[PDB]
Amino acid sequence: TNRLELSGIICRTPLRKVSPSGIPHCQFVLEHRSVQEEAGFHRQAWCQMPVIISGHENQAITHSITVGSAVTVRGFISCHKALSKMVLHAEQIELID
Amino acid sequence: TNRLELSGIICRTPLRKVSPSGIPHCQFVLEHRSVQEEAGFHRQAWCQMPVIISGHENQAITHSITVGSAVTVRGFISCHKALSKMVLHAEQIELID
Questions:
Q1: In terms of Cα–Cα distance, which of B25, B93, B87 is closest to B59?
Q2: Domain that residue B69 falls in
Q3: Which sign, positive or negative, has the C-alpha torsion A22, A82, B44, B2?
Q4: Cα distances (Å, whole numbers) of residue B58 to A47, A75, A82, B27, B95
């Protein structure tokens, strides 16, 4: 199992990237803030999550999202060592604007 | 929205912590490895995710998990700046041993 669903505001201008051999991607940073419940207590949760969306099929989304967009993203997480930097690979995104 | 579900192997010995004013916690590191699908391609996903489980109610789980346990955890993520270090606050855990 590997599934993250996270909402937030895009806080960095999205970067469009195209690979010569197909497979283009769009990367951005999603800032999440919420109140969560833990052991009976209500505490603040905050994160700035790198997000990537790949594939020709998804090329449209990039030109419809920008900094300040309210967005909910669902995908898998993957990490690489710097602790290790986390990226959310988005399978789906929903807009709230 | 803020929900992560992630399976893996506990790769660091769990640390039991009790606060004097109630609210005890148990922290550990969960190593995830899987094949995920992205833009048609099958690629490896890997992460070493800090996990915390809080509350008197959950005090038992700690003495039933150890390094090498296969485990699936579901909760919310929260981050703090070092990029920012991520922690999974577990609302529920399921064992696979």
A1: B25
A2: 1-97
A3: negative
A4: 25, 28, 32, 12, 14
Q: Would the CA dihedral through A54, B47, A28, A71 be positive or negative? A: positive
Query: In the numeric block, which tokens belong to residue A7?
Result: 């909402």
CATH for B20: 2.40.50.140
Q: Number of structural domains, chain B?
A: 1
Q: Which tokens is B12 given? A: 């660091």
CB B3 within 8 A of CB A47: no
What is the H or E stretch that residue A41 is in?
strand A41-54
Chain A contact for B33, CB < 8 A?
no
β-pair partners for B2 = A6
CA distance A79 to B12: 17
Does residue B21 belong to the interface with chain A, where contact is any CB pair within 8 Å?
no
CA distance A96 to A75: 18
How far, in Å, CA of A77 to CA of B7, rounded? 12
Contacts of A95 in chain B (CB under 8 A): none
Query: Which residue in chain B has the smallest CA separation from A6?
Result: B2
In units of Å, what resolution does this entry have? Answer: 2.1
User: Is residue B95 within 8 angstroms of chain A, CB to CB?
Assistant: no
Question: CA separation (Å) from A88 to A12, A36, B26, B70?
Answer: 15, 20, 26, 23
